[PDB]
Design a protein that fits this description.
The complex is a heterotrimer of chains A (97), B (272) and C (9).
Chain A lengths: L4 E6 L9 E10 L5 E6 L2 E2 L3 E2 L3 E2 L5 E9 L7 E6 L7 E4 L5
Antiparallel strand pairs in A: 1-2, 2-7, 3-4, 3-8, 5-7, 6-7, 8-9
Chain B lengths: L2 E10 L6 E9 L2 E7 L8 E2 L9 H28 L9 E10 L5 E10 L2 E6 L6 E3 L2 H12 L2 H23 L11 E10 L2 E11 L5 E6 L9 E2 L3 E2 L5 E9 L7 E6 L7 E3 L1
Chain C lengths: L9
The chains are: A mainly beta (97), B alpha+beta (272), C little secondary structure (9).
Subunit structure (chain A): Heterodimer of an alpha chain and a beta chain. Beta-2-microglobulin is the beta-chain of major histocompatibility complex class I molecules.
Protein name (chain A): Beta-2-microglobulin
Family (chain A): Belongs to the beta-2-microglobulin family.
């Protein structure tokens, strides 16, 4: 079994008040059973999930994404549950990454 | 060269002896179709605008073929469970990737078909499309079976025929987009976030296809600098992004350069 | 367009 790597990031460089798209890319995991949630201030956002696909080394990847408009106060994150993780992995969005 | 590729994932259930089957199809790095056998009355479905130019006959026939394929992978999960002497208590996975690259004459350039069981290489068609490479002793059973039945010729006939012909059709159908590479939009950001130094981050956004190289260079050293490098990731609109970062001493930012290589660039790119 | 996969492993 291989654990997931998790990246949280915007489609375009984030600017407060400018509509944008928030992405949680989860990759490199095996087996394919996985639970992925995009969170706004800790609350699950309604977000699309890509069709299950995999890379040349057979590990799987998924993108979970939705629209969002960054501002000064809201915090965004991604939570992932997988058999390889004793606790859910949470990665917080930061506009410098 | 353009390519047409399919990715099949079959997963068994510790339950009622049935299995989940997901298929995705790509032209180059552009996903254009999907199939999922848990949907009600499952169909092959479009996943990009241009493929919606196909008539309902196309979707009917692709649905028939992928539903049959899903049945085959359901049987294969059981067979491989038997080969490896595994119980029926746990879930297992069977994956295939196959596809074709288009040559300069409009014919097959390179073709492939590879299978993995529980995430490890199982069996692969060799480059000559006439022989197999088995990864262990269960795969040897499969290899003898497929050699005796000349399954390789089925694969070769598909790759040299319908695969490349349908790929040419797709390239014409999506000619407004599939012939495009998008060069990276690039910039360097500076983060004086720590006494450890100044972080410089070199960003490449919105590029297609996904292959790219970002490297940091320091004046007076030939080798690439050690860096923080994230895995290439989708932007969500079909393009990709990547960045590479490192920490440099406070006054020395100008002696570092980020070098970007991508097929959409007309010359290699040097940023500071 | 899809391959036709039908032979047992």
């Amino acid at each position: 079994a291989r654990p997931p790597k998790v990246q949280v990031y915007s489609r375009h460089p984030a600017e407060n008040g400018k509509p944008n798209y928030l992405n949680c890319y989860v990759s490199g995991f095996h087996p394919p059973q996985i639970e992925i949630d995009l969170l706004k201030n800790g609350e699950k956002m309604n977000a699309e999930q890509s069709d299950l696909s995999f890379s040349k080394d057979w590990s799987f990847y998924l993108l979970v994404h939705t629209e969002f408009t960054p501002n000064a106060v809201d915090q965004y994150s991604c939570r992932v549950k997988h058999v390889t993780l004793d606790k859910p992995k949470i990665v917080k969005w930061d506009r410098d990454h | 060269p353009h390519s047409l590729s399919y990715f099949y994932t079959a997963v068994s259930r510790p339950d009622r002896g049935d299995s989940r089957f997901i298929a995705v199809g790509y032209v180059d790095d552009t996903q254009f179709v999907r199939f999922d056998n848990y949907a009600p009355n499952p169909r092959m479905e479009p996943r990009v605008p241009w493929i919606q130019q196909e008539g309902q006959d196309y979707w009917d026939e692709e649905t028939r073929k992928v539903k049959d394929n899903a049945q085959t992978y359901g049987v294969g999960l059981n067979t491989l469970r038997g080969y490896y002497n595994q119980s029926e208590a746990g879930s297992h996975t069977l994956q295939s990737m196959f596809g074709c690259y288009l040559g300069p004459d409009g014919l097959l350039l390179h073709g492939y078909r590879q299978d993995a069981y529980d995430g490890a290489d199982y069996i692969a068609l060799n480059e000559d499309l006439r022989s197999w490479t088995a990864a262990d002793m269960a795969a040897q059973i499969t290899k003898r079976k497929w050699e005796a039945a000349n399954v390789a010729e089925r694969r070769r006939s598909y790759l040299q025929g319908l695969c490349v012909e349908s790929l040419r059709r797709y390239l014409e159908m999506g000619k407004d987009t599939l012939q495009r590479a998008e060069p990276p939009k690039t910039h360097v950001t500076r983060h004086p976030s720590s006494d450890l130094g100044v972080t410089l981050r070199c960003w490449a956004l919105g590029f297609y296809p996904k292959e790219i190289s970002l490297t940091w260079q320091r004046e007076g050293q030939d080798q690439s600098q050690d860096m923080e490098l994230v895995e290439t990731r989708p932007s969500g609109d079909g393009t990709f992004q990547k960045w590479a970062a490192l920490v440099v001493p406070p006054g020395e930012e100008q002696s570092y350069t980020c070098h970007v290589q991508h097929e959409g660039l007309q010359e290699p790119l040097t940023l500071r | 367009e899809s391959d036709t996969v039908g032979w047992s492993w």
